[PDB]
């Protein structure tokens, strides 16, 4: 499951995932907070005082981006160290996955897991 399960269940048409239901009814793809879509994947291992701008040309780097909600504490003000971020229309997302798994400039590095909302049960 989840592997590649809901592939491409959004291609033309259709309001953004999760939309019009018991969620206010918005109008195309979301802000920062980025709807639980296919395309939906997951980073972790980010810094804590890293930002969107240098977060998204690492995320960027293979296939540009459709959204991404980096989670902060707002106590703290400062990220969680992980995000979720969905990738446009681009065909290197198997890639990015593979490449960006451990992609971050310096010693560091950042996960990226499929967290694709498709069961395939059958």
């Known amino acids: 499951s989840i592997s590649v399960s809901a592939m491409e269940s959004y291609r033309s048409f259709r309001v953004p995932a999760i939309n019009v239901a018991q969620q206010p009814a918005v109008t ?64 290197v997302t198997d890639h990015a996955i593979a490449g960006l798994h451990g992609m971050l400039l310096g010693d560091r590095r950042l996960v990226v897991q499929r967290s694709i909302p498709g069961g395939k049960n059958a």
Request: proline share 8%; glycine share 8%; aromatic share 10%.
């Open 28 to 91: 195309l793809p979301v802000t920062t907070i980025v709807p639980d879509s296919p395309n939906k994947i997951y980073v972790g291992g980010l810094p804590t005082c890293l930002n969107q701008d240098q977060v998204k040309e690492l995320l960027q780097s293979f296939g540009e981006l459709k959204g991404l909600n980096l989670v902060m504490d707002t106590n703290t003000n400062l990220n969680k160290g992980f995000a979720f971020f969905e990738y446009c229309d681009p065909s």
